[PDB]
Symmetry: D2
Subunit: 347 residues, 4 copies
């Protein structure tokens, strides 16, 4: 049943030729589950790990991927509440040390010794992948594993970002880039949380897509010359919360300007080198808070997946084979491929 | 009893010669109290009201001052819970429209129609001053009105700033400029709130004054070349909260680095023209929050004054007459003022 | 325009014959608005003000009523933020000091000197009624004043009760009596706040009504012998929050039993003489919290009325004349009334 | 060297003769540490496990004890974050599956398969004991293990109870039985958290011990006939929070009566069979919250032990050998035990 040989995309040298070759199957540890990855999502963090732009050293050779869904085919001799046949989801944090204030408090991502999938630990761009049982996401049975793969990163991130914004039901939330990949999920989650969504995006068929994902007010920045004034007129003042999915510095400056007094601006994107240069006087007088948000925790994962199971959050995805992931990586480096890409590891 | 003539410092033109001449005494309105200011504090905000640097227009001619304590000598025909002989304190916010969204949630400072003392309303650099009965602070009886004058602005500000850091008892709080005017009150309030104080100031007799105000760890920035390392070694892996009383850009830039993961940095000073240009990657990964803090509300006033009454907060002040304020303003513009200054309106 | 004679229901003696006679019109004070009540809601609290069951003494002769909507026809010489022609709503709290320790934190309903409508102050079972301008609710223009009258008490109460349960979006909330007058509004508000509603009521056409207002699971207590088991099975162990709109002791006991561990049970009804005798062991081991909720504050009023304006909360109610209120009171004392009753002060 | 034989107090039958005989030494599992218990605290929960009064079944034969401190002499092949020679503390909750609703949110005490020390798992009333490495408390090096043993249960309980009252620094906290074993630690922790302590205990030399622990006001219930009036006069009203360390019903009733409006009453004691029969009208009108608190989590343990290390919490204890525990149990059943008892496992 469990084979000795599998196949996956592995890069031996940083910024080398990503190769799809036969690799040895991993053996699970005492606290690890062996998961047969069925579908894996492709993210820009994968391109980052391939280049080596982030400060942490990358274990080489390594198979990338940090959003993979599959079936628990193997289990360690210490795993507690898992069974063979259960749906498991590999996330960015592939485990950490359960003995420090950070982890004990729930922020196990800020653990000094944290394992990351597709960076420090072999990821989900293969057929069989191992994962820490405690950090593995419990995907409900009867769910399409191709549609839940995109929510294993984007979904949890946007959900935790709204929780960090600290809004009440009936409050206005401005989402920059609301008709994009991370923006659409944000709009849906905010609508399911009881917030009034205001979307600022510009393009063809973007307004329609926003209104078809439960959109309230859409600001087209291509047809609007002043975005701050528009947001301040549509929300009887500023928006109580502003989720910044746009990495542009100009966008974040406008975000600090069109936020409501005593409001929160949440930063999600991480373009290494960017600076949120804003007027301190404005923030101090209007008592504005700028919060940075990273990956979500175990509880956040559970809650976001529950919304997906209820059927309030959806992601239109395009499924391709694992044998074509090299060319997908090249198009991702060229910045041309559009849409959430999910890779079938079977073919 | 209530005279018809009084004396105060009034400036007819912006940036003109401050004069000490006899002016008509104010008559109370329906919801206003007539207070006989006994002692008034001099702040750097008065120099700003004199120059016209801030954006709001100033009412001329006007008597400045926003921190004044005295006895209620007269009240209007609507004042509800005040009596003749009670001690009252005039603050920055001298009233607001109690009918809107902000004035109802407690943030009555963000009210569209707010009256500010020494800017839009006649202040307390006068013997008799009027104030809204709802925004006036209730100072307990038997208190020195000369020692409670400095706590009517600095005190409330630092207290709300330490309440905006979301800290728990036993947590580390770093205060930049801990041996200054605002920094000292901050240290005392944080010690009375159950926080471990770490002070970063440099000078002669500053370490001693910090250890004398219940200080726990002091970093001399004049004898230390790396402040971030020092803080991350003393406050274990960073300070849970950082109160920035220093207006220097370099200071706030270093503040965002010696903060613990998931911590908050509070901005109190407002040097119009300054910018907190920091790395976005760091804030998003460590999940740091930058919050701006302004003047406190009525509840905050009541709590801070209660600490002062218990006797856990003290301010060494120097008393001078009101006939000499015209020259104190010039020393304040030259930037030669060092300690807190309180003015006696009697002489 | 403002007449000298009006008509209203007044009772000279406690438990006397309610009469509909011509009474002098009230003259506004300095901080009070003169509202021409157009529609007024009848509550069970009016029967209590008529009997004298509650502990506070009633001002006689008095015109009852605490939920009335109308137009501002006159205002005092201190009112700030109101205009002639604006829609105003009289609530239970109709006066405060607004300068104490409970009036400065928002809990102005616990103020030592609080004025209550229909108890200590003349209420809204009158054509012209006066009210404090700071506590009066701002009803948006273009709204049916007959449908917003029931939401000026029931609505705010249920909303604050759902905000006191400390629930998150996607959490389970059990409402006892979900097909009643205070239960239906609760279901609607909880659905608009993002909570999953579970209703426990028994009768004919109640399950259907629950499915029309937006309820998820319905437990018929007449067809179910074990309600605790049913709730623990419909949810994944119990309901995160339980709103008790039923005044029965048995119901509140079963409520403490079918709550999730670390959950909150909110008490809204007040049958003087009732008791929640529950096992202390259970509450201490499962860390359950029993919170009591009273009338809402000004912020809560605004938020609840905003939901009503968006159109997510509705109340099926009729409109009987004020000349027939003397008989509605008798039907209310007999306990034979169905639905929410609204009285037209014009007829 | 780890021996093969040890000595401990084991009871084969429920309510049988506790014996001190040589028993086999436990072998650690994959995620468990082998601790050489040096000092162990005796609680009333041990007498409960001996009688079988609580509902859960006990694992016989069993060695009781839930508060034991010692050195890690052996660890499993999965333990991650511990070293040989580190000080470890065994608590009530040993270890549970970190995979459900209770573990992931921090409430790992409400887990379906939770292991309890001295009830379901062998406790610390022996020489060598095993414990889950994730639930074991990290005691700092250089600490007296005899003084930190009493703070491994009582301390954490009182700390979490004072954190469940939602109190601010400068607020009043009433502790019933402030001069007892669980009351003294409560007073000390509340003084270190910045709260004003009001103690209600009656006896000889109790007022002095309270004023020496850090208590502000003391109410002698033996010399006072009305306790509610006294607590309402000493706290300008009522206490913002009330920690009930007394198990009597009269005390808890008077507790709901002398709490401030919008305050919280925390229940810590668990006399199976008691009831807080209380008036519901009062709780609903004053918006009072009755919260139940159980054992603390990993984060709470860390924080409480940090206070003990700073030196702000102290417990006067009496050390006795383990060969005499068979008689201490009988004194505890007679209810004549005075002070906190700590047993030396060496003798
Ligand atoms: Zn990703
Ligand atoms: Zn760790
Ligand atoms: Zn100032
Ligand atoms: Zn306002
Ligand atoms: Zn009512
Ligand atoms: Zn114990």
């Amino acid at each position: 049943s469990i084979p000795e040989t599998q196949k996956g995309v592995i890069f031996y040298e940083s910024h080398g030729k990503l190769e799809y070759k036969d690799i040895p199957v991993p053996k699970p540890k005492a606290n690890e589950l062996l998961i047969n990855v069925k579908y894996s999502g492709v993210c820009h963090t994968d391109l980052h790990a391939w280049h080596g732009d982030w400060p942490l050293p990358v274990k080489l050779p390594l198979v990338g991927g940090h959003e993979g869904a599959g079936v628990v085919v193997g289990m360690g001799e210490n795993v507690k509440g898992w069974k063979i046949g259960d749906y498991a989801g590999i996330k960015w944090l592939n485990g950490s040390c359960m003995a420090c204030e950070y982890c004990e408090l729930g922020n196990e991502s800020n653990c000094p010794h944290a394992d990351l999938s597709g960076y420090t630990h072999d990821g989900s761009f293969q057929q069989y992948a191992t994962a820490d049982a405690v950090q593995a996401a419990h995907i409900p049975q009867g769910t399409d594993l191709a549609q839940v793969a995109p929510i294993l990163c984007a979904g949890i991130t946007v959900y935790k970002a709204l929780k960090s914004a600290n809004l009440m039901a009936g409050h206005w939330v401005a989402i920059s880039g609301a008709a994009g990949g991370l923006g659409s999920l944000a709009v849906q989650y905010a609508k399911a949380m009881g917030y009034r969504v205001l979307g600022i995006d510009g393009g063809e068929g973007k307004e329609e897509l926003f209104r078809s994902i439960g959109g309230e007010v859409f600001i087209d920045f291509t047809k609007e010359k002043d975005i701050v004034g528009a947001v301040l007129k549509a929300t009887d003042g500023g928006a109580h919360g502003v989720i910044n999915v746009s990495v542009s510095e100009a966008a974040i400056e406008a975000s600090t300007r069109y936020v409501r007094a005593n409001g929160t601006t949440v930063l999600v994107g991480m373009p290494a080198g960017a600076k949120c240069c804003s007027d301190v006087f404005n923030q101090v007088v209007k008592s504005i808070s700028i919060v940075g948000s990273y990956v979500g925790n175990r509880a956040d994962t559970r809650e976001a997946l529950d919304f997906f199971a209820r059927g309030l959050v959806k992601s239109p995805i395009k499924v391709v084979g694992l044998s074509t992931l090299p060319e997908i990586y090249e198009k991702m480096e060229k910045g041309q491929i559009v849409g959430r890409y999910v890779v079938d590891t079977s073919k």
